[PDB]
Design a protein around this ligand. Structure first.
Ligand SMILES: Nc1nc2c(ncn2[C@H]2C[C@H](O)[C@@H](COP(=O)(O)OP(=O)(O)O)O2)c(=O)[nH]1
Length: 309
C-alpha cells in the first residue's frame, strides 16, 4: 500500500519521537510489522494499552520484560516500554512525562493497529497537554487527523489506524467482538484436566492437552467468552456440527468468511509457562512435560512465554 509507505518514510526522515501502541492481550495481532526498519533512526516508545484488564496476580515488571523481549524478537528496540490503561488512566501521567523527556523538543507521531485504543489514548494526551501551550489543536490531511501542540514549535500527531488483516478481531463483527473482549479485570479460572482432553475457547480456538497425565491449567479469558470442555476424540465431531451455534462466536456468516483453523504443537519443559492466544487470552501451565496442540485460524498468532506472575 503506497499510502502507508509514504508516511513511514516521512516519519523516518524526521527526528520525531515515535509512540507505538499495542494491545497487551493481542500483542502479535496488533504488532505493526516492518515499522522497525523505517524508524530505526528514531527513538521509539512502546506502549502496551489495556493494563486495567491484567489480573492482580500478574506483575507489571514481568509484563514489560515480556514486551521488551517480544519487540526485540521482531526487530524493535524501543527506548523504553510502558503499560497504560487509556480507558481508566493508569500510567498516563508517567507516559506523558516520558514523551516530553524523550522527544527532545521534536514532534511526536503516534501509531497503532485498529482497536488497540489509539483514539482513547489520543483523548488522554489532549487532556495531558491542554494546559501547556497557547497554540490550539489543528487537523491536517493524510497526503481529518489531529495535531496536538506540545509547545509553540512542536506537536504530537495522530496517524491513521492500521488494519491488520490477520488478527483475530478482523474476522469478527461488533456484536461478536464484544463477547471475546474482557469488560473488567480477568479472573484466572483453574482447570484440572486429564490426558486427551480438549478446551474450546468458543468456536474461535482449540486447546488440546494430548499427553502428560493429569495436570492443572489456569485459563485467562473474557468472562463473556464460553469455554467448552470435551474429550479429544469428541472435539473434531463437535466442531463440525455445532460451530456457529453452540461454539459461537463465530456466527454462521463469520464462519464462511474466515480462514480455516490450523494446528500447532507445543512441548513445555519448564514450570510456569503460558500458551498465549493473541486476541483471546492465555492458558498457564504450572508444571513441565505437557504436550499441547493449539488450534487457531490461519494467520492468527498463538505462542509460548514464561509466566508473568
Ligand atoms: N479495557 C480497556 N479498554 C480500552 C482501553 N482503551 C480503549 N479501550 C476500548 C474502547 C473501545 O471499545 C476499544 C477500542 O478503543 P479505540 O480508542 O477506539 O481504539 P482505536 O481503534 O482508535 O485504536 O477498546 C483500556 O485502556 N482498557
Amino acid at each position: 500500500d503506497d499510502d502507508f509507505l509514504r508516511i513511514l518514510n516521512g516519519i523516518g526522515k524526521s527526528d520525531a519521537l515515535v509512540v507505538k501502541i499495542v494491545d497487551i492481550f493481542d500483542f502479535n495481532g496488533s504488532w505493526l510489522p516492518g515499522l522497525h526498519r523505517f524508524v530505526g533512526n528514531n527513538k521509539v516508545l512502546l506502549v502496551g494499552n489495556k493494563a486495567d484488564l491484567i489480573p492482580k496476580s500478574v506483575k507489571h515488571d514481568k509484563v514489560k520484560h515480556w514486551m521488551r523481549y517480544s519487540a526485540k524478537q521482531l526487530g524493535l528496540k524501543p527506548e523504553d516500554v510502558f503499560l497504560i490503561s487509556a480507558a481508566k488512566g493508569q500510567g498516563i501521567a508517567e507516559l506523558a512525562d516520558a514523551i516530553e523527556y524523550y522527544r527532545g523538543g521534536k514532534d511526536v507521531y503516534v501509531v497503532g493497529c485498529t482497536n488497540v485504543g489509539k483514539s482513547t489514548f489520543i483523548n488522554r494526551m489532549i487532556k495531558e497537554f491542554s494546559d501547556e501551550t497557547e497554540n490550539v489543536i489543528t487537523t491536517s490531511h493524510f497526503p481529518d487527523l489531529i495535531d496536538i501542540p506540545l509547545d509553540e514549535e512542536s506537536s504530537l500527531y495522530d496517524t491513521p489506524g492500521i488494519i491488520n488483516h490477520h488478527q483475530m478481531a478482523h474476522y469478527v463483527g461488533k456484536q461478536s467482538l464484544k463477547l471475546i473482549t474482557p469488560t473488567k479485570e480477568i479472573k484466572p479460572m483453574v482447570f484440572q484436566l486429564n490426558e486427551e482432553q480438549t478446551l474450546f475457547f468458543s468456536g474461535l480456538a482449540r486447546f488440546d492437552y494430548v499427553s502428560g497425565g493429569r495436570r492443572a491449567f489456569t485459563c485467562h479469558f473474557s468472562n463473556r467468552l464460553t469455554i467448552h470442555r470435551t474429550k479429544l476424540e469428541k472435539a473434531d465431531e463437535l466442531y463440525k456440527n455445532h460451530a456457529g451455534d453452540l461454539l459461537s462466536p463465530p456466527t454462521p456468516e463469520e464462519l464462511e468468511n474466515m480462514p480455516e483453523l490450523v494446528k500447532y504443537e507445543f512441548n513445555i519443559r519448564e514450570p510456569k509457562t503460558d500458551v498465549v492466544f493473541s486476541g483471546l487470552g492465555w492458558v498457564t501451565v504450572n508444571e513441565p512435560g505437557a504436550k499441547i496442540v493449539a488450534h487457531v485460524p490461519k494467520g492468527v498468532s498463538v505462542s509460548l512465554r514464561k509466566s508473568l506472575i
